[PDB]
């Protein structure tokens, strides 16, 4: 009939964040794919699979005109791999850090690939715990004040974000230190890096007070580990 493609959120930093639904999907997949270096992450991901889908290898796919050429080749690669490793009624799982819906290209890639390679499949998305949810849980805070909007955005977008939206915003994908550029005396920040993991680091306080310190810390950690992923929440406590 058709194959099932599970797109499975595997959470952030720890195997404890996996849902029952995710575990069922992993255990029923006849093949596992991940579109991707960060050795710590590869190791965490393998640990999740070793625990729940032991005996199933992870097929990890890694990267002008060249990008467009790579996408076509990647599409052919994915379709061929799926057809080889699963029967016509079988199931493949794609692993996605956090939740598949949030700042991730896997679903888009799958949809493009299916169209280009004429791959008949039922796509089923399985939610997972996002970095945002780990940040708020580890700090023991609410993501909003009563009735308040929540603006989730990127470091690149932050300087162009309205003051009104910056009253309660979550910032992802910040390669720099964008809190320094938008803070007032009332701006409070909850920050975290390597959330969920044994190398988790949390900081909080007024940007007035801690912003330069966290900027220094983020560089220290990046030099040490070779990379860093942080998420933070800014709130105007006026
Ligand atoms: C490519 S997006 C993927 C988001 C993912 N789908 C999710 O639901 O969390 C990567 C961004 O997520 C955040 N991030 C992911 N893992 C993190 C972690 N363990 N600690 C802190 N931030 C993390 C950072 O903002 C990072 O730049
Ligand atoms: Mg205040």
Q: What is the CATH number of the domain that holds 122?
A: 3.40.1010.10
Domain termination site, one of 129, 148, 178: 129
The dihedral sign for the CA sequence 139, 173, 92, 86 = negative
Distance 238 CA to ligand 2 centre (A): 5
Q: Do residues 60 and 71 both lie within one domain?
A: yes
Q: Do residues 80 and 158 both lie within one domain?
A: no
Q: How far apart are CA 220 and CA 2, in angstroms?
A: 50
Q: How far apart are CA 99 and CA 103, in angstroms?
A: 9
Q: How far apart are CA 149 and CA 142, in angstroms?
A: 12
Distance 111 CA to ligand 1 centre (A): 22
Cβ neighbours of 90 (radius 10 Å): 16
For residue 75, give the nearest of 119, 105, 122, 123 by alpha carbon: 119
* Residue among 7, 129, 131 whose CB has most ligand 1 atoms within 8 A, to mutate: 131
Domain termination site, one of 105, 129, 153: 129
Contact 139, 202 (CB under 8 A): yes
Atom 16, ligand 1: residue with shortest CA distance: 131
* Residue among 8, 129, 172 whose CB has most ligand 1 atoms within 8 A, to mutate: 172
Which structural domain range is residue 70 located in? 1-129
Contact 135, 192 (CB under 8 A): yes
| Dihedral-angle region of residue 86 (phi above 0 means left; psi in -120 to 50 means alpha; beta otherwise) | beta
Domain termination site, one of 129, 152, 176: 129
Q: Do residues 137 and 212 both lie within one domain?
A: yes
Method: X-ray
Q: How far apart are CA 232 and CA 20, in angstroms?
A: 28
Q: How far apart are CA 19 and CA 128, in angstroms?
A: 7
Contact 122, 5 (CB under 8 A): yes
Q: How far apart are CA 122 and CA 141, in angstroms?
A: 38
- Cβ burial, residue 48 (10 Å; 0-12/13-18/19+): buried
Q: Do residues 6 and 28 both lie within one domain?
A: yes
Q: Do residues 104 and 172 both lie within one domain?
A: no
């Amino acid at each position: 009939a058709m194959r099932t493609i599970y797109v499975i959120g595997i959470g952030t930093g720890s195997p404890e964040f996996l849902t029952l639904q995710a575990i069922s999907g992993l255990r029923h997949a006849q093949a596992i794919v991940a579109l991707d270096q960060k050795s710590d992450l590869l190791a965490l991901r393998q640990k999740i699979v070793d625990t729940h889908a032991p005996g199933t290898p992870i097929y990890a796919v890694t990267d002008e005109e060249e990008v467009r050429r790579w996408h076509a080749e990647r599409a052919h690669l994915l379709a061929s791999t799926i057809r080889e490793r699963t029967p016509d009624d079988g199931a493949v799982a794609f692993l996605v850090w956090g939740d598949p819906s949030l700042y991730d290209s896997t679903l888009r890639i799958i949809e493009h690939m299916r169209n280009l390679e004429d791959l008949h499949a039922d796509v089923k998305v399985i939610p997972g715990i996002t970095a945002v949810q780990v940040l708020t849980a580890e700090h023991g805070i609410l993501i909003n004040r009563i009735g308040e909007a929540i603006h989730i955005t990127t470091g690149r977008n932050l300087p162009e974000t309205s003051a009104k939206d910056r009253r309660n915003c979550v910032v992802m994908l910040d390669g720099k230190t964008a809190w320094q550029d938008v803070a007032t005396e009332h701006t409070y920040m909850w920050w975290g890096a390597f959330l969920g993991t044994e190398q988790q680091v949390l900081r909080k306080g007024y940007v007035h007070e801690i912003g330069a310190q966290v900027a220094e810390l983020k560089q220290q950690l990046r030099t040490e580990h070779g990379w860093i992923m942080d998420t933070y929440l800014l709130r105007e406590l006026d």
